[PDB]
């Protein structure tokens, strides 16, 4: 159904909402999502900023999320990949 | 005895950026079917796993599994001699003190040869990927880039929520 990014900090708060969809002209700008379970997870911005560096390696980013383990972020190469496992915050 | 030819040095330079700014040292495992490399940050909350197959190179030949681990801030300095559009080659031997980095481009004029001295790192290799995750999604990497960059302004702490 819905993917929701939320930063709620000192000076204020910000909120981005995206929906899964299929694209016609550029199918590589589509937003894919399969949801077995609702997730609700907080991550350090510090680290996501190191992670996003891999944008310069692949068009798409593949995210796997779980309450049981570290989240996985993946940028695929032509015959290869670069993965980032990041543990969410306890509280 | 390793020889691996990236068709454009840009690629490898870009891959090292993924480790730098978040990790210091790293073992690079070279085997018949390509290169893999793993690193864990200081606080141990971030793992970086790299895999590059044979098909990502121009030429590639490795007739013997060889670990060459190295300081990344040292390695990136050599990568600054990069050009991005130069044909980069990596050379090693049976048990190497140094990896050899070899740049070339379109005119036969410019072949530079660099050499980085290797180190001993203890390989505590980690397989932490689960079978099943609660949710999986994929979107443009540039789009993700912005969301993180943006929300990083407001807080040290971004919260992802799928329902």
Curated annotation (Swiss-Prot), chain B:
Q: Enumerate the GO terms in the molecular function aspect.
A: DNA binding; DNA polymerase processivity factor activity; identical protein binding
Modification after translation (UniProt): Ubiquitination is required for UBC2-mediated DNA repair.
Q: Does the keyword DNA-binding apply?
A: yes
Q: Which GO terms describe its biological process?
A: error-free translesion synthesis; establishment of mitotic sister chromatid cohesion; lagging strand elongation; leading strand elongation; maintenance of DNA trinucleotide repeats; meiotic mismatch repair; mismatch repair; mitotic cell cycle
**What's the main place this protein lives?**
nucleus
The cellular component terms of Gene Ontology attached to this UniProt record, alphabetical and capped at eight, are: chromosome, telomeric region; nucleus; PCNA complex; replication fork
State its location(s): Nucleus
Positions the record marks as coiled coil are none
Protein function: This protein is an auxiliary protein of DNA polymerase delta and is involved in the control of eukaryotic DNA replication by increasing the polymerase's processibility during elongation of the leading strand. Involved in DNA repair.
Can you tell me which family this protein belongs to? Answer: Belongs to the PCNA family.
Q: What is this protein called?
A: Proliferating cell nuclear antigen
């Amino acid at each position: 159904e819905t993917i929701k990014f939320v930063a709620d900090g000192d000076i204020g708060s910000g909120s981005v909402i995206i929906k899964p969809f299929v694209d016609m002209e550029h199918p590589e700008t589509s937003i894919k999502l399969e949801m077995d379970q609702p997730v609700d997870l907080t991550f350090g911005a510090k680290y996501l900023l190191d992670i996003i560096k891999g944008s310069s390696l692949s068009d798409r980013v593949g995210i796997r999320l779980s309450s049981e383990a570290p989240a996985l972020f993946q940028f695929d190469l032509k015959s290869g990949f670069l993965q980032f496992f990041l543990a969410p915050k306890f509280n | 005895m390793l020889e691996a030819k990236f068709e454009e040095a840009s690629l490898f330079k870009r891959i090292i950026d993924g480790f730098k700014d978040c990790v210091q040292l790293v073992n690079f495992q070279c085997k018949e079917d390509g290169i893999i490399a793993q690193a864990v940050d200081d606080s141990r909350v971030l793992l970086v796993s790299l895999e590059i197959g044979v098909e990502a190179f121009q030429e590639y030949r490795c007739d013997h599994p060889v670990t060459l681990g190295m300081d990344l801030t040292s390695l990136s300095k050599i990568l600054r001699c990069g050009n991005n559009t130069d044909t980069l080659t990596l050379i090693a031997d049976n048990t190497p003190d140094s990896i050899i980095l070899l740049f070339e481009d379109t005119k036969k004029d410019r072949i530079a040869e660099y050499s980085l001295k290797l180190m001993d790192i203890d390989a505590d290799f980690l397989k932490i990927e689960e079978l099943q995750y609660d949710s999986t999604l994929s979107l443009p990497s540039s789009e993700f880039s912005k969301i993180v960059r943006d929300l990083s302004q407001l807080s040290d702490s971004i919260n992802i929520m799928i329902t």
